[PDB]
Design a protein around this ligand. Structure first.
Ligand SMILES: [Cl-]
Ligand SMILES: [Cl-]
Lengths: 211, 211
């Protein structure tokens, strides 16, 4: 309590054609042809879109507890990072609007906005915003993990504590999930879910009398 | 919300005479003498004392979001790990009792119990309980960082995300602080505070009429 969390912009969301690859392995789509060719295949009154550090003020200064993304006026991060705490941005209180403890996700100022859906076999990029480091794109080939309610992509990459909430993007620069909700395998490997919810939409119209 | 956090015992608190040392450097107290010698110097109804993983249940199973310590019936962890969330242990709800956002600390079921105070120049051990790994003692020589309200010990050691709340102990096996509230230096080095509060004590006696 005590509006102890604040936000600070760090980067914009995009795919980087050349970013470092990391992982024990690579998934590469090859196209083979008959001909014998083989080929490798206005200022808006809204928070600036992008990636932000989430910062908790104590005695040592501001420590980064996680990362989130503004997209269409809505701030998206992980449930475990904020547990619904108000977030200060430009002296304004941001209140939580929607949360999924199961998927480990939370949005502030509206419903989930991300539309990306990861396609098995494709490589993705995590835009890792580690405490005290410049943003960095990391290309990786996710596996899948088998859950109730469907199958989920799963990334085997280790980042510093505080990196949870960094977005995962596909080749069009669309966000397919957030990184940082994971488990550790018996062989000692950390794997993060590609955490993603359906984009929200308008319900039926209400009315009222409270002026 | 939804008692999504639970605890699981992982280890007991002790100094390990031989544990691995880690860090760019070592602080070693030498005693020199006149003689020319030089020398290197009942079951209780209370949660079992020790170190516990803090686990959040989602779709991938139980992910470790932090670590804390039971001592004298009180559970001690970091504020950023739970932000005051109820904790489930053996089907019982544990409610938070005291918290310090500035020191990044929280206790459940009573006031802070730890009595250890780190002494400049001494080496300490972090009992690192990393997600999916066995507990491990790590000996390190803390530096100091200069803050308001006094000087704080500061440890330059990197552990996996989820390790915050692991206790730091002195040579007598007394807890001098918890690891995992830190900042990152311009050279890219992570340093954690030795986070510690004064042990609590009984106040003046009240009375009442609410039977
Ligand atoms: Cl909507
Ligand atoms: Cl007390």
């Amino acid at each position: 309590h005590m509006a102890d969390l604040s936000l600070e912009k760090a980067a914009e969301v995009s795919w980087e054609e050349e970013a470092e690859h990391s992982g024990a392995s690579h998934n590469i789509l090859v196209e083979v042809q008959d001909d014998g060719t083989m080929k490798i295949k206005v200022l808006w009154d809204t928070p600036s879109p992008g990636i932000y550090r989430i910062l908790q003020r104590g005695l040592l200064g501001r420590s980064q507890v996680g990362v989130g993304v503004f997209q269409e006026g809505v701030f998206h991060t992980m449930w475990h990072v904020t547990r619904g705490a108000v977030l200060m941005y430009q002296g304004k209180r941001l209140e939580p609007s929607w949360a999924s403890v199961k998927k480990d996700l939370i949005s502030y100022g509206g419903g989930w906005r991300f539309q990306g859906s990861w396609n098995a076999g494709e490589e993705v990029q995590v835009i890792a915003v580690e405490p005290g480091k410049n943003p960095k794109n990391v290309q990786t080939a996710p596996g899948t993990f088998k859950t109730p309610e469907g199958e989920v992509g799963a990334i085997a990459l280790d980042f510093k504590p505080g990196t949870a909430g960094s977005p995962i993007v596909n080749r069009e620069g669309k966000i397919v999930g957030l990184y940082g909700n994971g488990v550790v395998t018996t062989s000692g490997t950390y794997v993060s879910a590609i955490a993603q919810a359906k984009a929200s939409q308008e319900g039926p119209l209400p009315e009222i009398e409270d002026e």
